[PDB]
């Protein structure tokens, strides 16, 4: 016998990944890249020059930099730079040519860049299935989503979703004159959905069974989350030492994510609740937000509270390590999807303080569907300290809070099952990996 065998393996398959330059898009892409590199794939991650440093410190993965109302031009710039990176890799020798580009779902034009260069495109959605179908329905323009909520109250019924009140819909009016643009960006994720080679969602099937099945019947979506493990952030040693020295189940973790900015009055209400509650607290107040703290209050600051507890204000923390720490009682969150799913994967019940876009819908599901949190009552009204304290008491000091915690521990076990061998998310990711190898 005489002939040649050709082997298609992860080690000689080159995966390109390109997140939108924002931490709630960068981070789940990174986690996915680590998982794919673990399977042996060659993974090159592309990111803008102004996020290269953060991505560089947080992480084996090859890293490439490109350059950065400025969105309309952002599309034009990264279309060109990523296309060039694809062609240069098509001609090199120290790497396999790219087989697939994993791109952020909010950049659907990258599908044309991939297909126009002869490679496959995988769209990574960074928000849950449930709010994403809301975007799809807004795009279809059949049902009327306009809200002059001063005139009456509406409740919207969509297939395979619970009834949504007005305050449960994605929040766009916060952006005022920019609401149309932000709206457009989320809706346009679905413009070319029938042409995407792989539709990836950072969620797990048991979490969103009804709507995921609905989507699975229209499109061939792959639920592959949580992508985070069951990434080196700044202040890791400082935060872990402080938490290590606290009592079990005693710390309220507070963070509003990477971009939300609260008013000075809102900061004062949160501050007065945290300084008077019967719990320790770790509160992330980003450097550029520190000036909105009450004047009566710099990498970090330590406090003894009016209730005799301890507080730490810090400009950033390793959130996943924080959420998995035994000292943490609950998570006061803006309900960004990464924060929500990270808390689910850690068993931490939540106090929901949503600010805009998908955070309002996420809080609806957190409180009423998954039943692992309580949502505060004001979408732009001030949340007063008395209301915050009410939610702390319900979550951390009530029999209802014990049930919320039991619920979160149940969902934590299911998220671990989903990404373990035989789990739905492990199967879907291996479907991605295996079929990329196909002849």
Ligand X SMILES: O=c1ccn([C@@H]2O[C@H](COP(=O)(O)OP(=O)(O)O)[C@@H](O)[C@H]2O)c(=O)[nH]1
Ligand Y SMILES: C[C@]12CC[C@H](O)C[C@H]1CC[C@@H]1[C@@H]2CC[C@]2(C)[C@@H](c3ccc(=O)oc3)C[C@H]3O[C@]132
205 binds, among ligand Y, ligand X, none (CB under 5 to 8 A by kind): none
Among 106, 271, 415, 424, binds ligand Y (CB under 6 A): 106
Candidate ranges 150-158, 262-270, 332-340, 363-371; the one touching ligand X (CB under 6 A): 332-340
Nearest to 285 by CA among 251, 262, 307: 262
Count of residues of this chain found to bind ligand Y when the rule CB under 6 A is applied: 7
Least separation in angstroms between CB 179 and ligand Y: 11
- Taking the C-alpha atoms of residue 110 and residue 123, their distance in angstroms, rounded to an integer, is 9
Using the rule CB under 6 A, is 185 a contact of ligand Y?
yes
- Eight-state DSSP code of residue 14: E
Using the rule CB under 6 A, is 382 a contact of ligand Y?
no
Cβ nearer to ligand Y, comparing 106 with 339? 106
- Output the CA torsion sign for 420, 424, 428, 434: positive
Contact 125, 201 (CB under 8 A): yes
Among 191, 259, 306, 307, binds ligand X (CB under 6 A): 259
339 among the known binding-site residues? yes
For residue 297, give the 3-state DSSP assignment. coil
In the chain, the N- to C-terminal Cα span, in Å, equals 23
342 among the known binding-site residues? yes
Cβ nearer to ligand X, comparing 192 with 235? 235
317 binds, among ligand Y, ligand X, none (CB under 5 to 8 A by kind): ligand X
Using the rule CB under 6 A, is 319 a contact of ligand X?
yes
- Taking the C-alpha atoms of residue 414 and residue 408, their distance in angstroms, rounded to an integer, is 10
185 binds, among ligand Y, ligand X, none (CB under 5 to 8 A by kind): ligand Y
Contacts of residue 14, defined as CB under 8 A and 6 or more positions apart, other chains included, come to 41, 42, 44, 89, 95, 96, 97, 98, 99
Candidate ranges 54-62, 182-190, 401-409, 425-433; the one touching ligand Y (CB under 6 A): 182-190
Using the rule CB under 6 A, is 316 a contact of ligand X?
yes
**What residues between 2 and 41 interact with ligand Y by CB under 6 A?**
22
Contact 214, 160 (CB under 8 A): yes
Contacts of residue 380, defined as CB under 8 A and 6 or more positions apart, other chains included, come to 174
Using the rule CB under 6 A, is 203 a contact of ligand X?
no
Using the rule CB under 6 A, is 36 a contact of ligand X?
no
- Taking the C-alpha atoms of residue 330 and residue 251, their distance in angstroms, rounded to an integer, is 7
| β-sheet bridge partners, residue 48 | 66
Which residues make up the interface to ligand Y (CB under 6 A)? 22, 106, 182, 185-186, 259, 357
Which residues make up the interface to ligand X (CB under 6 A)? 22-24, 27, 233, 255, 257-260, 284, 316-317, 319-320, 336-339, 342
């Amino acid at each position: 016998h005489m002939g040649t065998i050709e082997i298609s393996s992860p080690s000689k398959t080159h995966i390109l990944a390109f997140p939108f330059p924002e931490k709630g898009h960068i981070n789940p892409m990174l986690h996915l890249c680590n998982r794919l590199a673990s399977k042996g794939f060659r993974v090159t991650l592309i990111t803008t020059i102004s996020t290269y440093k953060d991505v560089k410190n947080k992480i084996l993965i090859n890293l490439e930099s490109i350059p950065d109302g400025y969105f309309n031009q952002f599309k034009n710039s990264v279309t060109e730079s990523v296309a060039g990176i694809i062609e240069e890799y098509k001609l090199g020798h120290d790497f396999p040519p790219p087989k697939v580009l994993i791109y952020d779902s909010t950049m659907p034009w990258m599908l044309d860049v991939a297909h126009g260069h002869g490679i496959l495109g995988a769209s990574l959605f960074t928000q849950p299935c449930c709010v994403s179908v809301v975007y799809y329905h807004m795009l279809q323009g059949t049902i009327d989503f306009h809200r002059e909520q001063s005139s009456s109250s509406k409740v919207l019924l969509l297939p395979c979703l619970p009834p949504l009140e007005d305050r449960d819909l994605p929040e766009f009016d916060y952006f005022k004159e920019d609401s149309g643009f932000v709206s457009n960006l989320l809706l346009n994720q679905f413009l070319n959905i029938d042409k995407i080679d792989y539709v990836l969602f950072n969620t797990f099937e048991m979490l969103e069974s009804e709507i995921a099945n609905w989507m699975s019947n229209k499109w061939k979506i792959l639920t592959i989350g949580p992508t985070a493990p069951t990434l080196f952030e700044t202040n890791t040693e400082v935060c872990m030492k402080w938490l290590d020295e606290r009592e079990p189940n005693s710390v309220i973790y507070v963070s509003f994510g990477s971009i939300a900015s609260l008013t000075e009055q809102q900061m004062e209400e949160i501050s007065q609740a945290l300084f008077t509650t019967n719990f320790n607290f770790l509160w992330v107040v980003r450097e550029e937000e520190r000036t909105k703290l009450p004047n009566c209050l710099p990498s970090s600051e330590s406090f003894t509270t009016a209730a005799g507890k301890l507080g730490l204000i810090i400009n950033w923390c390793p959130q996943l390590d924080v959420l998995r720490h035994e000292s943490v009682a609950c998570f006061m969150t803006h309900c960004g999807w990464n924060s929500t799913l990270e808390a689910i994967s850690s068993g931490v019940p939540m106090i929901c303080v949503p600010q805009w876009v998908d955070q309002t819908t996420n809080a609806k599901f957190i409180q009423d569907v998954w039943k692992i949190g309580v949502r505060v009552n004001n979408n732009g009204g001030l949340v007063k300290k008395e209301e915050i304290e009410r939610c702390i008491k319900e979550v951390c000091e009530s029999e209802k809070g014990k049930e919320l915690k039991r619920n979160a521990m149940k969902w934590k076990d299911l998220s671990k099952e989903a990404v373990s061998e035989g789990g739905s998310s492990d199967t879907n990711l291996e479907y991605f990996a295996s079929t990329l190898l196909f002849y």
